[PDB]
Design an enzyme around this catalytic site. Structure first.
Site, mmCIF file in Angstrom:
data_model
loop_
_atom_site.group_PDB
_atom_site.id
_atom_site.type_symbol
_atom_site.label_atom_id
_atom_site.label_comp_id
_atom_site.label_asym_id
_atom_site.label_seq_id
_atom_site.Cartn_x
_atom_site.Cartn_y
_atom_site.Cartn_z
ATOM 1 N N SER B 197 0.824 -1.209 0.000
ATOM 2 C CA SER B 197 0.000 0.000 0.000
ATOM 3 C C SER B 197 0.860 1.261 0.000
ATOM 4 O O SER B 197 1.625 1.487 -0.928
ATOM 5 C CB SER B 197 -0.941 0.007 1.214
ATOM 6 O OG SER B 197 -2.150 0.717 0.954
ATOM 7 N N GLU B 324 -8.845 -5.821 -4.219
ATOM 8 C CA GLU B 324 -8.339 -4.743 -3.387
ATOM 9 C C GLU B 324 -9.465 -3.976 -2.688
ATOM 10 O O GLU B 324 -9.581 -4.022 -1.458
ATOM 11 C CB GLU B 324 -7.471 -3.785 -4.219
ATOM 12 C CG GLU B 324 -6.276 -4.450 -4.921
ATOM 13 C CD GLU B 324 -5.027 -4.510 -4.048
ATOM 14 O OE1 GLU B 324 -5.136 -4.253 -2.833
ATOM 15 O OE2 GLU B 324 -3.931 -4.817 -4.566
ATOM 16 N N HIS B 437 -6.973 -6.576 0.382
ATOM 17 C CA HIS B 437 -5.840 -5.667 0.440
ATOM 18 C C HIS B 437 -4.985 -6.052 1.629
ATOM 19 O O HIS B 437 -5.489 -6.201 2.733
ATOM 20 C CB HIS B 437 -6.360 -4.240 0.631
ATOM 21 C CG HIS B 437 -5.349 -3.159 0.370
ATOM 22 N ND1 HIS B 437 -4.756 -2.968 -0.859
ATOM 23 C CD2 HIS B 437 -4.896 -2.157 1.162
ATOM 24 C CE1 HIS B 437 -3.984 -1.894 -0.815
ATOM 25 N NE2 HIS B 437 -4.052 -1.383 0.401
HETATM 26 C C1 LIG Z 1 -2.687 1.453 1.981
HETATM 27 O O1 LIG Z 1 -2.012 2.276 2.577
HETATM 28 N N1 LIG Z 1 -4.049 1.240 2.338
HETATM 29 C C2 LIG Z 1 -4.613 1.842 3.550
HETATM 30 C C3 LIG Z 1 -4.961 0.770 4.612
HETATM 31 C C4 LIG Z 1 -6.159 1.212 5.498
HETATM 32 C C5 LIG Z 1 -7.241 0.081 5.637
HETATM 33 C C6 LIG Z 1 -8.685 0.567 5.262
HETATM 34 C C7 LIG Z 1 -9.317 1.475 6.372
HETATM 35 C C8 LIG Z 1 -9.403 2.986 5.940
HETATM 36 C C9 LIG Z 1 -10.800 3.621 6.240
HETATM 37 N N2 LIG Z 1 -10.878 4.339 7.555
HETATM 38 C C10 LIG Z 1 -11.766 5.543 7.531
HETATM 39 C C11 LIG Z 1 -11.696 6.246 8.930
HETATM 40 C C12 LIG Z 1 -12.609 7.499 8.996
HETATM 41 O O2 LIG Z 1 -12.125 5.314 9.953
HETATM 42 C C13 LIG Z 1 -11.280 4.119 10.004
HETATM 43 C C14 LIG Z 1 -11.785 3.186 11.145
HETATM 44 C C15 LIG Z 1 -11.343 3.401 8.622
#
Ligand SMILES: *C(=O)NCCCCCCCCN1C[C@@H](C)O[C@@H](C)C1
Ligand SMILES: *C(=O)NCCCCCCCCN1C[C@@H](C)O[C@@H](C)C1
Lengths: 527, 527
Positions: B197, B324, B437
């Protein structure tokens, strides 16, 4: 005499014709309008004054004044559609095939030939429906109208040349049928009008036009729609490209009157000679002089009428051919030839799509391409060729039809939709052309019934079963007496039309038409 | 002592760890920069002054200051990525797993964790690569950097908070490796950096950034690219959304100095609390503080650099995961739930696509939809769900990677591309999420090797064979010693990564990426 008939316009003498081991009568060449010659050229159609004798209707009449094809001299496949009688400005006539003995009140069918509104003939061998009247027992009528500038020059405003006169001929011929078809045995309250290409677009134009809906009952539209991109131009476009005609024949364009007069002085073939020079762009499936949304024959825009159900509501049976585009690519696109596999290159392809969506900007052409391109093998020549054969059909025939279908089928009283995809076994055109534009008509007119024409038995059987569909529908309002499903805005069912056991599908070219009918247009406006 | 090592920064004491029936040494927590605490907050990384004793590297260090997930308390699948050591501003350290007996000069691997640049940890159980160093016999290094505003606040112009400091930490950690990895047995001229990522985007950012290319040899990028839409913001955007942070914590925004000072006064968790409030729109797969094309760390725009081959040319091995998007839809889209089939409705779907392409206008959203919609069954819930799982991956991961691939693979010395699509047999996430992912890392780090973790034998075998690919490549510059084909601008070959007999394909998501990488962008500009 079974051949002697008395119409409201005068007595008329017919002729007995042989039909598959039997015989019937045909009244050919009956006139329904005054010769659109001279000062009347470009003018609306004129009713035909009564004749004080017995009119002879034993021979087909002149074909209208039209552009004749010479791209494949000799070759039947092409010459088969060319006019087959002395072309002339005096052409507004109709032919009627009546069963024998003569009926008292049977289903009537009126046929409106195609030609891109620039060509056509009622006297074509394929249009010889002595087999339909015969086999199906109907009274077949072949109306004829003015094609070309001769019948579509749109100098809106002018009354000497207002436009759509050609559709007006069509109308004055439907009236005559409505007025005297009873004396021929026909039933004026069960008259179906059916057509191909421009004739299918004319059919539906008569469903939209307030002034003609009351002139027929139900309709059959083949490979055509009124809302087809090449079926009409605006009054400005017709005006602009009408002037460009005068400019081309070196006319005086100081005023309408001068122009119109000038155009009326030029022989027919001079108009024909520079006819195609007025189009706005290099294009495929686009014709010069076609109906204009003038505000009279057409109250408002086509779409807006299809949106307000401002159209004749009845039953309609319609469809499309598997490979429409073929004919226009071979005749206009680079990389195509009558005698080769015409496998196209990304280039030729990319260059063809510009010829197909001429009104498209670069972002648009991009959308089209990305849409009809297998990027996993973008060099496939057979693919590039076929995907190009799909853009011409999709965009010019199937999709504009599927939008008029879905819109109509929401005010209409019933809709039956077909997808004809059988390649005549005796076709002469290169196989790469597949199920070609206008090659269902022969099945519709029962040519597979006459032996000498070389058709499988399977083929004569499709014609016979297709003819009954058309005829049964024309009489009952439903093709059926194994069942061809009704098209509904819910389950958009349709069927296949070929020698294989009926198969029912649903949602003809949804995807491609969501792009043509919905995405592209939007994009092309944003951009 | 095999555990006693002398670096250019001071002596360091390691620790013996057990590894699959054997043992090796690990030097955990070594510091590579000065504590980025206090007035130094937001400032670029500071080299770590030498220590006059013996530093104890027997225990993992603090995790940086980051947003911790609480959407699925308890649940391992989620908590498995949360920080596992006292978070702290004093976090710039690195861990080194060295084989035993200690080598004299072996292949070195440096790992850069992901986290959307807003999260991450080097001390994650899945990142415990005592198995890689062990099995593959390499010296594994786990660098760590500053995520969040703490390490990405971009008040360009200011020197107190210029931005990209977090990438700068990454760099100061690669230098340290370049300077002392020899005393640990590693070979400073055969050091591979690999990541997932944001870590995969950082890897390639070090290939672009002139100031770091000389710090490593080859790279492995997993589910990430520097030219990824969420991987960077402009200096204006970073500025605007940096101010919006002060505005959110009620800071003085009269001038940079006031702001920066203020932000430097707020405790860490206060910054974290209002972190997500600065994003420009409601979106999916978009993070607050990420690298800015500042003109220093990045000479010019990413594309223009990929266009002029203005990047480190070497070997690279990279790829993507089959599914993903999953993770971001479950966490942000309506209609998704950890405990259901999350079949979506045309509506929820249509509403998700807006969350996916947030920078898209209505004509755009239309293009996307028409592009990822089966109009032959547009109500399929499982389809609506998957096609939505495809837009998130395609647009945010695969496509931006496939463009950096094709661009690099035209100046690079070799490219190997994989498509990992195997669903861990012990995954806890709902099956509807597929190959998620970040769930290849466990195969990459050889977790399927430790029994107690419940994995098929087939699975432990993929990990073993994948680990050798990574390691063999890292050392030889080629994954091979059955063959994984070289990616060429000609035949864009790649392979599948799963327990089934190697299969080679070619042209990963061409079609979808021609739309994302070429059509959409164009359209979105015309419109
Ligand atoms: C690569 O760097 N991918 C990023 C990995 C992050 C995993 C997905 C979660 C991202 C979404 N967030 C949004 C915020 C507002 O709350 C959290 C709990 C989840
Ligand atoms: C429905 O009305 N379709 C139209 C039927 C016409 C058949 C295709 C031929 C049209 C292309 N033209 C172009 C001009 C410039 O030359 C002629 C020979 C062919």
């Amino acid at each position: 005499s079974e051949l002697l008939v008395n119409t409201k316009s005068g007595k008329v003498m017919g002729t007995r014709v042989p039909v598959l081991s039997s015989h019937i009568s045909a009244f050919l060449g009956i006139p329904f309008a005054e010769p659109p010659v001279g000062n009347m050229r470009f003018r609306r159609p004129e009713p035909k004054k009564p004749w004080s004798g017995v009119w002879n209707a034993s021979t087909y009449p002149n074909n209208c004044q039209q552009y004749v094809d010479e791209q494949f001299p000799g070759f039947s496949g092409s010459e088969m559609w060319n006019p087959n009688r002395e072309m002339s400005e005096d052409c507004l006539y109709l032919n009627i095939w009546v069963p024998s003995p003569r009926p008292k009140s049977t289903t009537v069918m009126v046929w409106i030939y195609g030609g891109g509104f620039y060509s056509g003939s009622s006297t074509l061998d394929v249009y010889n429906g002595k087999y339909l009247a015969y086999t199906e027992e109907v009274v077949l009528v072949s109306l004829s109208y003015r094609v070309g500038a001769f019948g579509f020059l749109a100098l809106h405003g002018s009354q000497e040349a207002p436009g759509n006169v050609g559709l007006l001929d069509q109308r004055m011929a439907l009236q005559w049928v409505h007025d005297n078809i009873q004396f021929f045995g026909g039933d004026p309250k069960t008259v179906t009008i059916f057509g191909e290409s421009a004739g299918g677009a004319s059919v539906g134009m008569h469903i939209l036009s307030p002034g003609s809906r009351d002139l027929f009952r139900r309709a059959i539209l083949q490979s055509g729609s009124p809302n087809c991109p090449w079926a009409s131009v605006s009054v400005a476009e017709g005006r602009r490209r009408a002037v460009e005609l005068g400019r081309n024949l070196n006319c005086n364009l100081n005023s309408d009157e001068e122009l119109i007069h000038c155009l009326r002085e030029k022989k027919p073939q001079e108009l024909i000679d520079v006819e195609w020079n007025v189009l706005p762009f290099d294009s495929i499936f686009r014709f010069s002089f076609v109906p204009v949304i003038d505000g009279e024959f057409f109250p408002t825009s086509l779409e807006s009428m299809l949106n307000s159900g401002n159209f004749k509501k009845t039953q309609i049976l319609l469809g499309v051919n598997k490979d429409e585009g073929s004919f226009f690519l071979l005749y206009g696109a680079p990389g195509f030839s009558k005698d080769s596999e015409s496998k196209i290159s990304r280039e030729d392809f990319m260059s063809g799509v510009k010829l197909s969506v001429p009104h498209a900007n670069d972002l648009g052409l991009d959308a089209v391409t990305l849409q009809y391109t297998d990027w996993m093998d973008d060099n496939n020549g057979i693919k590039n060729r076929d995907g190009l054969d799909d853009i011409v059909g999709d965009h010019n025939v199937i999709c504009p039809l599927m939008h008029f279908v879905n819109k109509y089928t929401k005010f209409g009283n019933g809709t039956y939709l077909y997808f004809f995809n059988h390649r005549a076994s005796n076709l002469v055109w290169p196989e790469w052309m597949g199920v070609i534009h206008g090659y269902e008509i022969e099945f519709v007119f029962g040519l597979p019934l006459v032996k000498e024409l070389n058709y499988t038995a399977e083929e004569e059987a499709l014609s016979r079963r297709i003819m009954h569909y058309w005829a049964t529908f024309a009489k009952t309002g439903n093709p059926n007496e194994s069942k061809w499903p009704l098209f509904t805005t819910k389950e958009q069912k349709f069927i296949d039309l070929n020698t294989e056991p009926m198969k029912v599908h649903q949602r003809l070219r949804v995807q491609m038409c969501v792009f043509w009918n919905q995405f592209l247009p939007k994009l092309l406006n944003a951009t």
